[PDB]
């Protein structure tokens, strides 16, 4: 062979070229493939890193982070190409794979919580437990909805204050809808002197509630002496009425009661402390 | 060989074609297989991405998310095909596998909590601890059930307000059924002047409870002086009666008591503060 | 060879059939094995998906979920067969393996909590800390046991209300048994005027407890002035008696005491507020 | 060759038997080895599944769970044998490995908490912070030990009520030993009229504590006016004495004090509310 | 061959050189490649470890940690090169890979929480729920924003005190914006003698609110007797007005009220305790 | 060949021995190596399982757990040897590896918490924030140190009660050292009649603190009227003094004050409730 | 061949040496390489285990743990060498790798929390939110900084007590700086008789604040009647002034006020309880 007398000495006279052509050429094929892969990945990364910016800038963005992210991802893709080259030549990169995988796991964990809100949003969207037009509470947070979307929900307070809350939080909690039900019960409590007649007061109260229309006479209308306290005996009342008027009626009756009790001669006592007196 | 004098020079005269036909053809078989795999996966992904939409739109859906998800999954399947190609040509994609696996782990973690509710629902369904017709409490949340399903349960409040709660939450908590048991005990407490006779009051109370039918005379009927306070000595009473009438009887007895005590001459005192008086 | 002049042209005249028969046949063996595996797995999955239903329907089930689960698992098994085929032809499915493994991890995490209750149940069963016939508390939840099983335990309340609680929860908590011990101590507190004689009261109390049989005279019977308050001086008492009668005796003594104190001339004072008086 | 003219046609006349005997026989060796492995594993699993029962039934067990577990583990071992067979023939089972590994991870997580108690038990055993004969508190749970073992510890309450608590819980908490120390301090508080002489009271108290033997005169004996309140001025006292008698002495001194103060003419006042009076 | 008679004895006369040239040379190629890789990685690490410092020192830094980190990362890169060498010679380093991967996982977990704040910052930035110029509360922390960035946010307190809070914390919480809404409601409560006329007071209050301009007459203006207390009957009032003036008006009205009530003859009573008097 | 006419028939006359000697012998080498590995591992495990006991029994141990652990680890090592054998013959044990790895992960998780205390101990040891001779608090747990070691720390209470707390717990918490600082401030509060002269009292207090030596006149000595209270006006005082005498001086001054105030004619009032009186 | 007639019988006459020289020599090369690796690793571990001690002892250390750690790490490195040997001979050690990796994961988890403090320290160092010279609070822990470093931070209390807190804890919390801002607002509250003139008091207060210089007349100076209270009507005041003098001025004004009010004839009332009197 011309291999090892022109470009090399006659090393053992053991001409390797024709004997091991495939072997010696395997390295070369590996090498060429590698470098080609490299350059193509490079140009691709450049193009794409600018292209994503091209597409995103139309949408709402910030420039600094846009640039930072595009450049960083570009660099990472590059790294990918590199490891592939190393693998082709026959180097052990499993360690590199391991470390980068650990990094991916760590970042996934870091963002997990945020991601959960995404999940929550999707879920509630398909389920539609409540809608923006509706008025509800999400647990300690009452007020009307304004909008609901990607990661957070937007609702207004009775005072008007706007509040925002993440989706992941709310789904975990319990939920209450008032809009979905038209009618609701109402409750009242009263306290009076022990002497006073329970029957008189009872029928009085009755006459009042009779007087009202908005009440649901169909539905029950309970009036009892609930329980006994230390200062006053305490009555309870129950009614049903449409959600819309619930508050108003709630106020109205109370005024009525006050007027009617004084007319009746009844009284609501003050805290009563009894004493025994001795001089010393 | 005709290999390296027509399409190539006489490179070492070492005709490789017949010598390494299998070797040189291995690349080609890899290549063709790869590209074929690619295109088939592509058309499949297209078809399926539209087909899932076809099937789902019949069901309740939102268009934006439907499109988003279908397109995204389509793209992902595509990616799968790509990596397979790279593998056939003989590139090291283990890093890619690692990163995508980390991503899958992260997303699974993010949605884990939601998924738990699914599990809870299935479990309770087969176990059937409670049923929609029944009235129960799930811990701080009393009211009647309305429905129970995929991830959440629906029940009504005594006031009527509708509430919803995730399944995963409830299973963790303790559970209480009232429907399942027909009868329940009841309790009462009373407070009186120290002077008053305990025997008189005792037999009085007794006579009352005797008077009632709904009480379970079979079952015990305890009446004791529970303990002594700072203002009044305090009695306790116990009874049993069917769940349905429990509340009513509870009210009835109290009225009786009030009437009977005044007849007896007994009195419930007010808070009593004793004093010693000196002028200065 | 007849290979490449009948079914093919004379491509390099390099007849491959006899030269590479094993090689060219390897693909075929792979292929046939694959498809065979496929079909067998398919029929198996069909049979088994119906068979599990056959077996389970005898037991308590719901039809919708039964069908859903059987079909889903059927489909999954199918998928298994598919990947095996792909592997035989020589495709890289490690990515698929990775993603499905991530999914399995996620679901395991989701159900982990529920599973913990299983573990708890098994544990308590072999340990037998308490038994259904017995009466205990599990921390804030007192009442008698009714039954204990797979994931949850069932006990009754003193009021009769039935309650259910998951096994995983209880094992974590502390546990208290009353049935296992026959006898228990009891405690009492008293408050009196500062003027009153401690020795008189002491011997009185003593005489009372002497009067009782159910008390364990063998065991200690402590009677001290525990400590001094702002309104009265406060005594304490201790006794021992069998669990069964514990409550009754507890009540009995108190009645005795009241009677005996008035006979003694002692008194339990009311809250005493001293004053100094000046006119302005 | 006799291969492909007797049992087969003259397919390409390319007699494969002698040419590829090793190759064609490799399949067979794989196959035979596989099936043999299968059957042996089967019989082994049967024997062992019954053998474990044989051994365990001697110990405390429940039959249902014993059977369930033995059968389940038997089945699992079987599955192992199966996958090995599949591997020998040359099928890709890595997916199966992955899923079963995910399952193992999930179950380990589920039982982790329980297992922690095991760890705790071992630890405390070698460390021996406290012993069964001793009396201690583990944080909110005071009472004497009864026994300590595998996963839980057993102690008695002062009232006698038996309580059980898991080992994992306690090790986490703080721990307090009374037995290990023979002597302890004691504290007292007092409140008196502002007018009264502090020196008189001081020396009085002193004389008392002098009177006692059980007190450790060697150790300090502090007596100060701790601080000033709104109703009275408040004294503090400190002493040391052996654990055993600690309670008794604590009571004794108090009686002494009461007697001695009345003799002294001192008094403990009641809550004093001053007033200004005007008529309207 | 000249192999084993010059440099070695005639070991079995089985000249290995020409027979196994490729085999024996494989080791050598491995070896040379390895060492070359080593040295290049070394020089690279040196250069880069200094280069990063060169670049970072321009930015705000601390020298000690800068040096520490640069040196440590340098060393780690070195380690990478080493394992690659070991792999080429044909040693099993999978254990090393495993341990270092476990370490990476641990560190990722340790820093996860901090990293979460990064995520939060990015998210809020693109979402822009609130802006620095605006005044808001983040839950228990009210005050005006100053700046928001990488991991933390900076806002000022009403008192002026500067406060800082991590981003990860806030995103989790609920959020409230006042700037975004121009107008808000306001509330008031009042308490008066039971005797006093509700109509008189009502119209008075009305006249006041009429008097004000800043109030939104368009919007509702509620005036009711909210509920009844133990000492005074209690009124409520509601209004709407721009955020900017909200506080001022809130104060103004109150002054008005005080003046007007005394003019009216109304009075706000003090806590009223009723008594019954007996001498003993 | 003599292979298949003596010990076998003339199967295809295709004598395999000389043709495939290496192949057929590979199995044998695998087999012999395997069994040898087995037996050696066995004897090793026996020896070592007894040897560890030999070494440990000298140290403090319990016999039951010693035996249990030694036997269990012995068995596990055995298992290792087994899997290696299976691997040599050419069986797929990756599943076994997976399951045992899952088990190791689970146990590591279970013991993690305990292990954390180890870490804490090491850390504090090198850091030496506090030392046994010193007196400190670790958050809600004040008292003097006794000893600190492997997993827990030991300190004494002021009352003398011994307490133990795990290391992992404390490091998490905040830490407070009193020994490390020689001097500390002190605070006092007072309340008096509004009429009384602030200047007189001020100079009085001043004269007192002047009277004391132990006070650090160098350091500030603040005396102000902190705030005006409800029943009385309230003064504050500040001083500095060595830790050792801090308590004593704190008491001393108070006595002084009491004496001096009565001399001054000042008084500390009682809670003052004003009234308005009307007969009905 | 001389192989199997001198050192062995004529086994099948199938001389293996020259036929399979490479094969039979492969074992040997594996073996020699292995043992060499072993011994070198051993000597290295010895040297290094002593060398680390040599280097560390200069720094602050404890001997027992130093020795323990050095020996343990030495042993572990040894183990590494061992597994490599086993791998070369061709044994399956993947199980060993798995278990040791699980152990590494467990230990990383155990120390994770501690490590987090490291991260926190680094972060705060580069960010420099606060500096040692400055005075701040970290949430419930106010006092001046002393030093900040590796894992913990050191600050002094107003009382002087030294406190230490881990870095990981603080970063999580919210942070407050007083040093960074020069000026701060101040607040005051007052309560007076309802009769008293608001205008008089208002202008009085005004005159006072006018009197002061340190106040920022530029900045607002609010004086309103905040709200009407129960026993008294309650005023509020606001001011701004430099941090340094904030406390002093805060005290000064109060003294002024007291003096000026008595001069004005105003009074701060005591709690006023009204009564109604009847004899029985």
Curated annotation (Swiss-Prot), chains A, B, C, D, E, F, G:
MF terms (GO), sorted A to Z: identical protein binding; mechanosensitive monoatomic ion channel activity
Topology versus the membrane: Multi-pass membrane protein
Localization per Swiss-Prot or TrEMBL: Cell inner membrane
Record keywords: Cell inner membrane, Cell membrane, Ion channel, Ion transport, Membrane, Transmembrane, Transmembrane helix, Transport
Pfam families assigned to the protein according to its UniProt record, in alphabetical order: MS_channel_1st, MS_channel_1st_1, MS_channel_2nd, MS_channel_3rd
Residues in the Periplasmic compartment per record: 1-30, 89-90
Domain of life: Bacteria
InterPro entries, per the entry: LSM_dom_sf, MS_channel_1st, MS_channel_C, MSC_TM_helix, MscS_archaea/bacteria_type, MscS_beta-dom_sf, MscS_channel_2nd, MscS_channel_C_sf
Transmembrane segments: 31-52, 68-88, 91-111
Principal localisation: membrane
One GO cellular component term: plasma membrane
Residue ranges that the UniProt entry lists as topological domain Cytoplasmic: 53-67, 112-280
GO biological process: intracellular water homeostasis; monoatomic ion transmembrane transport; protein homooligomerization
Family from the record: Belongs to the MscS (TC 1.A.23) family.
Job description of the protein: Mechanosensitive channel that participates in the regulation of osmotic pressure changes within the cell, opening in response to stretch forces in the membrane lipid bilayer, without the need for other proteins. Contributes to normal resistance to hypoosmotic shock. Forms an ion channel of 1.0 nanosiemens conductance with a slight preference for anions. The channel is sensitive to voltage; as the membrane is depolarized, less tension is required to open the channel and vice versa. The channel is characterized by short bursts of activity that last for a few seconds.
Quaternary structure, from the entry: Homoheptamer.
Domain remark from Swiss-Prot or TrEMBL: The channel pore is formed by TM3 and the loop between TM2 and TM3. After a sharp turn at Gly-113, an alpha-helix (residues 114-127) is oriented nearly parallel to the plane of the putative lipid bilayer. On the intracellular side of the channel, the permeation pathway of MscS does not connect directly to the cytoplasm but instead opens to a large chamber that is connected to the cytoplasm. This chamber resembles a molecular filter that could serve to prescreen large molecules before they are allowed passage to the transmembrane pore.
UniProt protein name: Small-conductance mechanosensitive channel
Gene: mscS
């Amino acid at each position: 062979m011309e291999d090892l007398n022109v470009v090399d000495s006659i090393n053992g006279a053991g001409s390797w070229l024709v004997a091991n052509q495939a072997l010696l050429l395997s390295y070369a094929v590996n090498i060429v493939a590698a470098l080609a892969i490299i350059i193509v990945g490079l140009i691709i990364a450049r193009m794409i890193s600018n292209a994503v910016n091209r597409l995103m800038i139309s949408r709402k963005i910030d420039a600094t982070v846009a640039d930072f992210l595009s450049a960083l991802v570009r660099y990472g893709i590059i790294a990918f190409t590199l490891i592939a080259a190393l693998g082709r030549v026959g180097v052990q990169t499993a360690s590199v794979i391991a470390v980068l995988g650990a990094a991916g796991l760590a970042v996934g964990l870091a963002l997990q919580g945020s991601l959960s809100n995404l999940a929550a949003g999707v879920l509630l969207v398909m389920f539609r437990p409540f809608r923006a037009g509706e008025y509800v509470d999400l647990g300690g947070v009452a007020g009307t909805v304004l909008s609901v979307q990607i990661f957070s929900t937007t609702m207004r307070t009775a005072d008007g204050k706007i509040i925002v809350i993440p989706n992941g939080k709310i789904i975990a909690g319990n939920i209450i809808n008032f809009s979905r039900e038209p009618v609701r019960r109402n409750e009242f409590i009263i306290g009076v002197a022990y002497d006073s007649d329970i029957d008189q007061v009872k029928q009085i109260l009755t006459n009042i509630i009779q007087s009202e229309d908005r009440i649901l006479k169909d539905r029950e209308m309970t009036v009892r002496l609930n329980e006994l306290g230390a200062s006053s005996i305490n009555f309870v009342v129950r009614v049903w009425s449409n959600s819309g008027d619930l508050q108003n009626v709630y106020w109205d009756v109370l005024e009525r009661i006050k007027r009617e009790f004084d007319a009746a001669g009844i009284s609501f006592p003050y805290p009563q402390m009894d004493v025994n007196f001795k001089r010393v």
